[PDB]
Design a protein around this ligand. Structure first.
Ligand SMILES: Nc1ncnc2c1ncn2[C@@H]1O[C@H](COP(=O)(O)OP(=O)(O)O)[C@@H](O)[C@H]1O
Ligand SMILES: Nc1ncnc2c1ncn2[C@@H]1O[C@H](COP(=O)(O)OP(=O)(O)O)[C@@H](O)[C@H]1O
Ligand SMILES: Nc1ncnc2c1ncn2[C@@H]1O[C@H](COP(=O)(O)OP(=O)(O)O)[C@@H](O)[C@H]1O
Lengths: 443, 442, 28, 421, 436, 132
C-alpha cells in the first residue's frame, strides 16, 4: 500500500522524559548512549541559543549514523529546517564550493513571519483605457490611465490604474467578466477564472468557474509564512516579482548560482532584525547534515573553520566511516575519520557501536514487519546467522527476494527453502570477491 | 527499423513459476541469472519496495547487457527504463551529483489522470475578431452535428490553432478541449463555390451523429525530471529538449515532492517506479559512488541495475584497488547476480538464433565451423562474421552460405589474437609505445 | 432558469468572417 | 446495523500532528493517558482540532510568495491604485560620486572622452573607415553603409527590439543555410505534410502529453524588487532611475496596446500600422496555471485536506439516494466548515442549529449537522469515538423503524486510543 | 545588534588596554596573552593613525591559543565606519574570478572614503490632507496641514506632490518624512492615536541634517565601470574589473582628498588560514602592499614548516621567505591552568550557565589535559543535561555525564586504533561482519 | 520526396473587391481579391481568399513585382521586381529578377536530402518564437 524505502521504520529517538532510552522503542534497537547524546543535542537545539555547534557521528559502516540523523530530524519537527546533504554535493560547476557551503548554511536557518497583504479582488465589470494626447511622442506610453470596475460579494468599487498595474493586468490576459486578484504588495495579479454568474457551458479552454469573492474589496489579510534566509538571499540577488523591466527580464533569463556577497547577507540580517524587533517574525535555527564528510577536501574544512564562528551559523552534524585516513586534497596529513585536527577541536564526537546477533535479529524482524512480510522463527534465526556472517545490510536486503519467491510459491510465510534459494541466486560481497579471485578472464 | 546486436531478445523467457526455459523469447541458457533477473522484475512490478541496488557481474561476452535489455523488454509499457552508460555523468554544465539526480528522477514516473471533452461536428461559421496588430485574438465558433447546433466562444490558443490547418465552413473537425487538438477529419459539403487559391483535396466524410460533446478520461505518463524542468523556469519545455537544465535548485525538488504526494493522495496521480541501468559502472568516480550510496536511501529512488565486467581493479579517483572497481560500502548495499561463460552448445544456439534473426541461411557444416570459431576466440567475432559471409555469398550469386564463404570471411577479417600475433611479429612496422617506428622498407 | 452569456466586446478590432457560402474580411 | 469506518492520515494532517508532537511535548504518552481519562486538556482539544480539520486550526488562505516589499499601505468616484513597491534594502550613494563621476560637468571629462571613444575613433565610422564599411557591406549584404556603426553603438536588447529587416542584397556572401531553408518552410505550414511534421515535434509532444492542463507545482518563496538606490538631494537620480526601471520602449515592448487604443490611434488619428511601437514580445507562459505565482485555494483541495471529510464526502456520494442525518458532536467551529463545504461545492438540502418537526415531516431533506424524540430520522451518522457513552446515549436518544450506525474514525492518532479504551 | 546568537567569540568586546597600552589581566572579556595584546594594541593605534599603509602582520602559534580571538578583539575595538574585511583562505579560489583579482577585491573592500553631505528634510505629523479633484483631472490642487510638537503649518501642493502623496496613501494622523529635492516620501508610522506607533517629532521643520557616508573603494570601482551596475555589489557578479577604471578611481579619490571634499579612512584586512593560499597569490600579496591605497593586512596561521601550496618544497609557517621578510610576526603562547579557568568562567557567564565550583574545576582540568574548545563545547551541553534533571545549577555529575557521552579527540583516536578492523583504512578494506 | 503545387509570375493587378451587403461600421469588406499573374507562355487570373490580402500588404506587394503563392499554405513570397518594370531609371534599390519561365501553375516533385543531425539541431533551437 505505502511505499517503504530504506530506514522507514524510524519514528524518532525513542527517549524518555528523564533523558534515558528504552531498548526497543521509537523504531530503534540498541545504541543507547548515542541516542541519549542525540537527545541532549536536540534539547540544546530547541533551546535556540547557541550558534556554531558541531558534532560527529563516528563509527563503522552499517552502524546507524544516518539513522540517528533521521531520528534527530523527526524529533525536531517540520518547523525546524533539516537540510540533508552529502559531501559530494558541494562540488558544483557553476559556483565555488565555498559559496555552496555558505548557501547551505543560510538554508538551514529558518524564519516565520506574519505578513499583512492588501488585496483588491472581484469581478471585472467594466474596463476602459484612456489614451494619451501624443501616443507617438516617444516618451510615456500609448495610454495614460485605465479605469477598471471590480465588484466583490456585497460590494463594488471603481479602480483607476497607472499603466504598470494595467500592464500586469494585460500580461495575465483578463477579460470582461473574469474574477481577478490584485495584490497591492507587489502589483502581482492572478486570474482566478470566469465568473459563474454567466453561462459556463460554452468555453473551449477548460476554464474554471469561481463564485464571487466574499467580503468587500480592498481586503487586508494576515498570512503566516515560513521562509529561510537563503530564500531572501536568492530573491534579492535575482530580483523577480517586481513590475519593472529588471524583474520582467529576470524571469525569462536562465537562472545561475552566483557568489552572493557579504553585504547582501548583512543587509538581509539587518532587515530580519527589524522584522523581529517589530514582533512580526521569529527566528528558528535548524540543522545541516553532511553525510560522508570524508568526501570534502581540505579547502571546505578550512572554510568551515571560519564559517562556524558566525553569530547566525546553525548547528551542523557530520558522519564518517573512515578510521586513520589521509585527508582528501592533502598528501601526508593523516587524521581520524578523514577530518583534519583543526576541525576536530570544534567537534564533539559521538561514537556508535556495532551490533550483536540478537540485535540483528530484532532489526530484521522489525524490517520484516515494516515491509508487511511474515517470517517464521527458523528462517528469522537463519537470517540472523547470515547477518552476523556476511553483513547486516545483505540480510536486510534479502527479505524482498524471499518475499518474491514466497508469492511465487503461493505462500505468505518465508520458509527456510526460500532463504536458501535467495542465498543461491544473489551473492554478497565476500562470495563474489572469492569468485573474482578464482577466475582468469577478470570476471 | 534497423537490426542491432541485441534485437533477438523479445522478453526474458521465464514461466509463471519464475523458471527459465532452455530457449525462450530469444534467450538461451544462463538459468540462474535469468531466474534472478525475473525475481528483480517481479520486485519492480510490485512497486512497494524502493531504492534497491542490483549489480550484474561476470566475464565479457556473457550476456549482462543482454540480460538488462531482456528485463527492459519484459518491463511492459508505460514503465521508465533509463539506460545510460558510466560516462554520461561527467559534464561541463552539470555536476556529478546533479547529473545522477537527474537520471534518478528520469527513471521514476508519474501517471496522471485527466478529464477531457470531445467535440466533433460540421463547422457552420467562424467569426474571428483580431486586433489591428494581430495581438489580441477573440471570436466565436459555430459547430454542428445532425442532432443539435451549438455556439462556442474561442480563446487565443484555439484561434491560433484554427489558423494553421485552415478550416473552411463545412469541415468536419474534432476538438479535444483539454489537449487543444484540432483534427480535420475531412470536408463534408463539397461546395460548388471553390477558391482558386486553395489546393486542399481533403476526403469526403459522413456527417457525424449523436451528441456533440463527449466526456472521456485519459492517462499519460511523465517523469519527475520532466516536471522538475517544467517548474524550474518559464521556458522549461524547451529545456526538456535542448538539455539546458543547469543545476536545478533543491527548493524546486522539495516542492514537487510535496506536490506529487498531494496528487497521490487525491487519486489524481499514480507513482510507478522504474529501472535505472548503468553500463560499465566502474567508469564512475568515487564521489558518484558516495552519492549513489546516500541517494539510494530516499523515498523516490528506483531499482538501480548495475553492470560490470571487471575483476579486482583500481577504483577511479582513489589510489587503491577494490572488487569490481566498486568500494565496499556500495557493495554492501548491492546484491550481486553472477553470470557464467558458455559451452559449445549454447554458442551454437546463440549463432543459430542470430542467423535466424539476421535473415541469413547457413548450412550445418558452416554452423559447426562458426560454433568452433566462436568457442575458440569469441562469440562476438562469429556473430560479426555471419554478416560478411552473407555478403560474400550474395557476391558469389548463391542463396545459401557455404563453408568456403565463411573460410574466406575468416581469412579476410581478423580477430583479436591473430591481430596481436601479427603486431608482435612486425613491431618495427607499427608505432611503439615509445613512439619509435621504421617506415622505410629497407 | 438559464444563465446569461458573457458580454462579448467586439469594438475596435477587425473581423474575419467565414460562413457556409462565401468568405468576408472587414478591416480598418 | 453496525458499521465502523477507519480513515488514514493525510500529509498536511501528519505535518500538523508532528509539529504539535514536537513543539508541545510534555510526555505524549501521558498526554495520551490524559485523553484517556477525560493545560493538559487544552493540548487534548488542540490535538483533536488537528485530527478533525487543518482549517479548524488555521484557515488556508492564498499561497503566494513572501513580498519582500515596502510600499504604500493603508493604516485604515474612484480610488486610484498606483504601483509603489520598493526593496527595503536601500543603498545610499553620496551626491559627490554621482555628480562627479557619472554626470557631465564643466570640470568633468566624461562627455568629451565618451565621444572620442565612441564616435571619433570608431572603426565602423564611414567618414574615416569607408573601405571597411564597404567590405562588410559586400560580405553581409546590408543596403545601408551606416548599419554597422549603428549596430555597434546600440544596447543589445534595443537592437533585439528594433530588429525587423527584410531587404538584403542578393550579391552578397550571407547565405541561406539548410536549417534556415527548413525554418522558412515551417514559418507557416499546416499538418499532414512530411517536411513540416518532421520539424514540428515539440508541439506534437506538447499536444500529445495533455501538457496545457498540468497544474503548477512550484512557486518561489520570496519575491523581491531590485534594490532601491537612494541618493539624498538630487532629482536627477530619481528621474534617471525612473527612466531605467520603467523604460517606455521596453515596457511597451513586453506588453500590448489595448484594442480600443489601437483603433483610436490607427483610424481616428491616422497613425500608420508600421508606426506603432513594437508589442507582444513577452514570452507566452506554458499554461494559464503558470501565469502567476499566486495559487488560489482550491475548494476541491479542502475536501482532501481532511481524511475524515474526504471519507464523509465519499459516503455522501454513495448515500445521496437515501436519507440520513449527521452528528458533528462536541467540537465547536466544525459547524461553519461543513456549512461552507456543502454550500460551496455540493449543494444539499440541509438544516442547522419547531423547524425540527418541520424537517421531521419532510422526507426528502437530509438533516446534516447537529451538535451536542427524533424517530422520524432513518439513519444517524456519527463518530462513537467519545469518552462518555452517556453522551452517546443522549445523542442516540434522538435515534422510521430502522437504524444503520456508521462510526467515523481516523487511524494513527489519539482517536484510536480513545476507541480502544 | 542584528541577528546575534551566542558564538565562539561573542564575549570579546575589544582589547583590555589602558591609555599607556598596558594590558589589564582580565578586561573587556579577554584574558591572557599580554604581549600579544600589547602588540595588537600597537597595530590598532597604527590603524587609528591612518598615516601608514600596506603593512603586513602575522599572528602565529599553536591552535586554540587565541589568534582569532585577538583579531576579533581588534575588529571590535576598531569602532564603526572603519572598514574591516575578514576572509578565509579558501575563498579566493573562484570558478568565475581569478585569484589575484579576488585578492584585489578583498584589498579594495577595506579602504573607505568619507563624504559629508547636507540635505533638507521635512518630518512632521500630518493633521489632515485636502485635495479637490478637477472637472476631468487636468490640474489637481490641494492643501496640506502638518504639525509637530511645537509648530503648525499649511502647505499648498502642486501636481507632483499630490501625485507623490496619492502614491504611498497618506491619511490624517500619519508621521511622514518629505524629501523636497528628490520628491521622496517615507512613512515613519502612525502617531499616538488610539482609534505601528511612533512619537510625534520635535519642532523646527525644514531642518538641516548632515549624514556622513562611508563607501569602500570597491563600490566606486564597480560603479565607475559602466558595464557593472550597483547590483553587482549584491549579486556578486563583477567579472574581473579592469585596471583602467581602478587607476581612474585612484586619481579621482586622490584629487578629492587634496580638494577637501573627502577623507580617506584606511582599514584592516584579516585573512584566516593564510597557509591555504598558493605561491602566486603570495607573490601578488608581496607586490600589492606597496601601493598607497592598501590596508593593513592581518594573517593568522598555525602550520609549522609545512609545504607551500603549488610548490614542492617546505617553508616556515607555510609561507615563502620573501613574504615572511615583508611581515612582522606576533607569537601567541599557550595557556596555563588559571587562564583556562577564567576563560571557562567567562564563557559560562555569557552562555548563562550557573555552575558549581567543583564542576568548574573539573572542566578546568579537562581543559588542561584536552584542548580548550572541548571544555568550551562541554559547558553548554552539561547545562542541557542539568536542565534535563530539572536542576538550574550545573553539578559535577553533569560534567561527568557529558564527558562519558561526548568524546574528545584522543579518546576517539584510541578507540579507533584498538578497533581498526571495523572502520575503513586508506586501502578501503573493512570487515563489516561481526563474527567469523 | 515531396510535391509542390505553386503559383508564381509577374503580377498585373490586385483588386480588393468589396462585398455586396458590406456589413456596417467597417469600410473595405473584402469578399475576395483578384490577382492577375503572368509569366512566359501563360497568364492566369486568380480568385483568392479574403485573408491573403493581409500578407499582400505585409510583404509590400504592388503591381510590377513577381510573387510566389502556394496552393496549400497560401502565403505570398515577393521575389522582387520584374526587369521590364524598371520604371525608376535614375535611383532605385529594388532587386530585379527575370520573369519566370514555364506556366504559372507548375506542380513538381522535389527531393530533399538532409541528415538527422540537422533535424535535431532544427528541432532543438526555437523555431520562430517571436518573443524576446
Ligand atoms: N539502531 C538501529 N535500529 C534499527 N535499525 C537500524 C539501527 N541502526 C541502523 N539500522 C538500519 O541499518 C541500515 C543502515 O543505517 P544507516 O544509518 O542508514 O547507515 P549507516 O548505518 O551506515 O550509518 C538502515 O537501513 C537502518 O534501518
Ligand atoms: N543468454 C543470451 N541470450 C541472447 N544473447 C546473448 C546471451 N548471452 C550472450 N548473448 C549475446 O552476447 C553478446 C554479449 O553480451 P553483452 O552483455 O551485450 O556483452 P557482455 O556479455 O560482454 O557484457 C551480446 O551481443 C548478446 O547478444
Ligand atoms: N585571551 C582570550 N580571552 C578570551 N577568550 C579566549 C582567549 N583566548 C582564546 N579564547 C577562546 O578560545 C576559543 C578558541 O580560541 P581561538 O581564537 O579559536 O584559537 P585560534 O585563534 O588559535 O584558533 C575561542 O572561543 C576564544 O573565544
Amino acid at each position: 500500500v505505502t511505499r517503504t524505502a530504506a530506514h522507514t521504520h524510524i519514528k524518532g529517538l525513542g527517549l524518555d522524559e528523564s533523558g534515558v532510552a528504552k531498548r526497543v522503542e521509537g523504531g530503534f534497537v540498541g545504541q543507547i548512549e548515542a541516542r541519549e547524546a542525540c537527545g541532549v543535542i536536540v534539547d540544546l537545539i530547541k533551546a535556540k541559543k547557541m550558534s556554531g555547534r558541531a558534532i560527529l557521528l563516528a563509527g563503522g559502516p552499517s552502524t546507524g549514523k544516518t539513522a540517528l540523523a533521521l531520528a534527530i530530524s523527526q524529533e525536531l519537527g517540520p518547523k525546524v529546517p533539516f537540510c540533508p546533504l552529502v559531501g559530494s554535493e558541494l562540488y558544483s560547476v557553476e559556483v565555488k564550493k565555498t559559496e555552496t557551503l555558505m548557501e547551505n548554511f543560510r538554508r538551514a536557518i529558518g524564519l516565520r513571519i506574519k505578513e499583512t497583504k492588501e488585496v483588491y479582488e472581484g469581478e471585472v465589470t467594466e474596463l476602459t483605457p484612456e489614451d494619451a494626447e501624443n501616443p507617438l511622442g516617444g516618451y510615456g506610453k500609448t495610454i495614460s490611465h485605465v479605469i477598471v470596475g471590480l465588484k466583490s460579494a456585497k460590494g463594488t468599487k471603481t479602480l483607476r490604474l497607472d499603466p504598470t498595474i494595467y500592464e500586469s493586468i494585460q500580461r495575465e490576459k483578463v477579460s470582461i467578466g473574469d474574477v481577478i486578484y490584485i495584490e497591492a504588495n507587489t502589483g502581482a495579479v492572478k486570474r482566478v477564472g470566469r465568473s459563474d454568474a454567466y453561462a459556463t457551458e460554452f468555453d473551449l479552454e477548460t476554464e474554471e468557474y469561481v463564485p464571487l469573492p466574499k467580503g468587500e474589496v480592498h481586503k487586508k489579510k494576515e498570512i503566516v509564512q515560513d521562509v529561510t534566509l537563503h530564500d531572501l538571499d536568492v530573491a534579492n540577488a535575482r530580483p523577480q516579482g517586481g513590475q519593472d523591466v529588471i524583474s520582467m527580464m529576470g524571469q525569462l533569463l536562465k537562472p545561475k548560482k552566483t557568489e552572493i556577497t557579504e553585504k547582501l547577507r548583512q543587509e538581509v540580517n539587518k532587515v530580519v532584525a527589524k522584522y523581529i524587533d517589530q514582533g512580526v517574525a521569529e527566528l528558528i535555527p535548524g540543522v545541516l547534515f553532511i553525510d560522508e564528510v570524508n568526501m570534502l577536501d581540505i579547502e571546505i574544512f578550512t572554510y568551515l573553520n571560519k564559517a562556524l564562528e558566525s553569530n547566525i551559523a546553525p548547528v551542523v552534524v557530520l558522519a564518517s566511516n573512515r578510521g586513520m585516513t589521509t585527508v582528501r586534497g592533502t598528501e601526508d596529513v593523516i587524521s581520524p575519520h578523514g577530518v583534519p585536527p583543526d576541525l576536530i577541536d570544534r567537534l564533539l564526537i559521538v561514537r556508535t557501536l556495532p551490533y550483536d546477533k540478537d540485535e540483528i535479529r530484532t532489526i530484521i524482524e522489525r524490517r520484516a514487519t515494516v515491509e508487511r512480510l511474515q517470517v517464521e522463527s527458523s528462517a528469522l534465526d537463519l537470517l540472523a546467522t547470515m547477518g552476523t556472517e556476511t553483513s547486516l545490510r545483505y540480510a536486510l536486503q534479502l527479505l524482498a527476494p524471499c518475499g518474491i519467491l514466497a508469492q511465487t510459491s503461493n505462500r505468505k510465510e518465508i520458509v527456510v527453502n526460500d532463504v536458501n534459494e535467495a542465498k543461491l541466486l544473489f551473492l554478497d560481497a565476500k562470495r563474489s570477491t572469492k569468485i573474482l579471485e578464482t577466475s582468469a578472464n577478470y570476471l | 527499423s534497423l537490426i542491432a546486436a541485441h534485437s533477438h531478445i523479445t522478453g526474458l523467457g521465464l514461466d509463471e513459476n519464475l523458471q527459465p526455459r532452455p530457449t525462450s523469447e530469444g534467450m538461451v541458457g544462463q538459468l540462474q541469472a535469468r531466474r534472478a533477473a525475473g525475481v528483480i522484475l517481479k520486485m519492480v512490478q510490485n512497486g512497494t519496495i524502493a531504492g534497491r541496488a542490483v549489480l550484474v557481474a561476470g566475464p565479457p561476452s556473457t550476456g549482462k547487457t543482454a540480460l538488462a535489455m531482456g528485463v527492459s523488454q519484459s518491463l511492459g509499457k508505460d514503465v521508465p527504463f533509463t539506460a545510460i552508460a558510466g560516462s554520461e555523468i561527467f559534464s561541463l554544465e552539470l555536476s556529478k551529483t546533479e547529473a545522477l539526480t537527474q537520471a534518478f528522477r528520469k527513471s521514476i514516473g508519474i501517471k496522471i489522470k485527466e478529464e477531457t471533452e470531445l467535440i466533433e461536428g460540421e463547422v457552420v461559421e467562424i467569426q474571428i475578431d483580431r486586433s489591428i496588430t494581430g495581438g489580441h485574438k477573440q471570436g466565436k465558433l459555430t459547430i454542428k452535428t445532425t442532432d443539435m447546433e451549438t455556439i462556442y466562444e474561442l480563446g487565443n490558443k484555439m484561434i491560433d490553432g484554427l489558423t494553421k490547418e485552415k478550416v473552411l465552413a463545412g469541415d468536419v473537425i474534432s476538438i479535444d478541449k483539454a489537449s487543444g487538438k484540432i483534427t480535420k477529419l475531412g470536408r463534408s459539403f463539397a461546395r460548388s463555390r471553390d477558391y482558386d487559391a486553395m489546393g486542399a483535396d481533403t476526403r469526403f466524410v459522413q456527417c457525424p451523429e449523436g451528441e456533440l460533446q463527449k466526456r472521456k478520461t485519459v492517462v499519460h505518463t511523465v517523469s519527475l525530471h520532466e516536471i522538475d524542468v517544467i517548474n524550474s523556469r518559464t521556458q522549461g519545455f524547451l529545456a526538456l529538449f535542448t538539455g539546458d537544465t543547469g543545476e536545478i535548485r533543491s527548493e524546486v525538488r522539495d516542492q514537487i515532492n510535496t506536490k506529487v504526494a498531494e496528487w497521490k493522495e487525491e487519486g489524481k496521480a499514480e507513482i510507478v517506479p522504474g529501472v535505472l541501468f548503468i553500463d560499465e559502472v566502474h567508469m564512475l568516480d568515487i564521489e558518484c559512488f558516495s552519492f549513489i550510496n546516500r541517494a539510494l536511501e530516499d523515498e523516490f529512488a528506483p531499482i538501480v541495475m548495475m553492470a560490470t565486467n571487471r575483476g579486482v581493479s583500481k577504483t577511479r579517483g582513489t589510489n587503491y584497488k577494490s572488487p569490481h572497481g566498486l568500494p565496499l560500502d556500495l557493495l554492501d548495499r548491492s546484491i550481486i547476480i553472477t553470470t557464467k561463460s558458455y559451452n559449445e552448445q549454447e554458442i551454437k544456439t546463440i549463432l543459430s538464433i542470430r542467423a535466424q534473426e539476421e535473415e541469413v541461411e547457413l548450412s550445418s557444416d558452416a554452423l559447426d565451423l562458426l560454433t568452433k570459431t566462436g568457442v575458440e576466440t569469441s562469440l562476438r567475432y562469429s556473430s560479426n562474421l555471419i554478416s560478411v559471409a552473407q555478403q560474400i555469398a550474395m557476391k558469389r550469386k548463391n542463396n545459401t552460405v557455404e563453408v568456403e564463404d565463411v573460410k574466406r570471411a575468416y581469412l579476410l577479417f581478423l580477430d583479436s589474437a591473430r591481430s596481436v600475433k601479427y603486431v608482435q611479429e612486425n613491431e618495427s612496422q607499427y608505432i611503439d609505445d615509445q613512439g619509435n617506428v621504421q617506415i622505410s622498407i629497407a | 432558469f438559464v444563465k446569461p452569456r458573457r458580454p462579448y466586446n467586439s469594438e475596435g478590432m477587425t473581423r474575419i468572417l467565414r460562413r457556409y457560402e462565401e468568405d468576408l474580411f472587414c478591416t480598418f | 446495523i453496525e458499521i465502523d469506518v477507519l480513515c488514514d492520515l493525510t500529509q498536511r494532517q501528519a505535518k500538523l500532528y508532528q509539529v504539535l508532537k514536537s513543539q508541545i511535548s510534555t510526555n505524549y504518552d501521558a498526554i495520551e493517558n490524559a485523553a484517556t481519562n477525560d493545560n493538559l486538556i487544552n493540548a487534548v482539544m488542540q490535538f483533536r482540532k488537528v485530527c478533525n480539520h487543518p482549517d479548524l486550526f488555521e484557515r488556508a488562505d492564498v499561497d503566494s510568495p513572501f513580498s519582500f516589499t515596502t510600499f504604500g499601505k493603508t493604516t485604515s468616484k474612484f480610488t486610484d491604485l498606483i504601483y509603489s513597491s520598493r526593496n527595503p534594502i536601500k543603498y545610499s550613494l553620496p551626491r559627490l560620486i554621482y555628480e562627479d563621476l557619472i554626470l557631465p560637468n564643466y570640470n568633468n571629462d566624461v562627455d568629451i572622452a565618451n565621444k572620442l571613444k565612441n564616435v571619433k575613433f570608431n572603426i565602423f565610422n564611414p567618414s574615416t573607415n569607408y573601405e571597411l564599411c564597404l567590405f562588410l557591406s559586400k560580405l553581409t549584404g546590408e543596403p545601408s553603409l551606416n548599419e554597422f556603426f549603428r549596430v555597434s553603438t546600440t544596447p543589445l536588447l534595443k537592437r533585439v527590439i528594433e530588429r525587423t529587416n527584410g531587404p538584403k542584397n542578393t550579391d552578397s556572401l550571407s547565405f541561406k543555410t539548410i536549417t534556415q531553408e527548413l525554418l522558412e518552410v515551417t514559418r507557416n505550414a499546416p499538418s499532414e505534410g512530411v517536411m513540416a511534421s518532421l520539424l514540428n515535434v515539440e508541439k506534437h509532444a506538447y499536444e500529445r502529453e495533455y501538457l496545457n492542463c498540468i497544474q503548477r507545482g512550484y512557486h518561489p518563496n520570496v519575491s523581491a524588487p531590485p534594490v532601491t538606490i537612494e541618493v539624498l538631494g538630487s532629482s536627477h537620480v530619481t528621474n534617471s532611475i525612473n527612466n531605467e526601471l520603467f523604460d517606455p520602449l521596453i515596457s511597451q515592448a513586453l506588453s500590448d496596446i489595448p484594442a480600443i487604443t489601437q483603433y483610436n490611434m490607427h483610424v481616428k488619428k491616422g497613425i500608420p500600422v508600421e508606426d506603432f511601437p513594437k508589442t507582444g514580445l513577452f514570452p507566452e507562459p506554458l499554461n494559464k496555471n503558470f501565469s502567476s505565482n499566486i495559487s488560489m485555494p482550491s475548494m476541491d483541495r479542502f475536501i482532501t485536506e481532511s481524511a475524515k471529510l474526504r471519507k464523509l464526502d465519499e459516503l455522501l456520494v454513495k448515500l445521496k439516494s437515501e436519507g440520513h442525518r449527521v452528528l458533528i458532536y462536541f467540537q465547536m467551529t466544525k459547524m461553519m466548515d461543513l456549512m461552507e463545504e456543502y454550500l460551496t461545492y455540493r449543494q444539499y438540502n440541509h438544516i442547522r442549529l419547531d423547524l425540527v418537526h418541520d424537517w421531521q415531516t419532510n422526507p426528502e431533506i437530509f438533516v446534516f449537522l447537529l451538535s451536542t424524540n427524533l424517530t422520524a430520522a432513518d439513519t444517524v451518522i456519527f463518530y462513537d469515538s467519545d469518552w462518555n457513552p452517556t453522551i452517546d446515549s443522549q445523542a442516540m436518544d434522538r435515534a422510521t423503524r430502522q437504524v444503520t450506525v456508521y462510526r467515523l474514525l481516523v487511524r494513527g492518532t489519539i482517536e484510536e486510543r480513545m476507541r480502544d479504551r
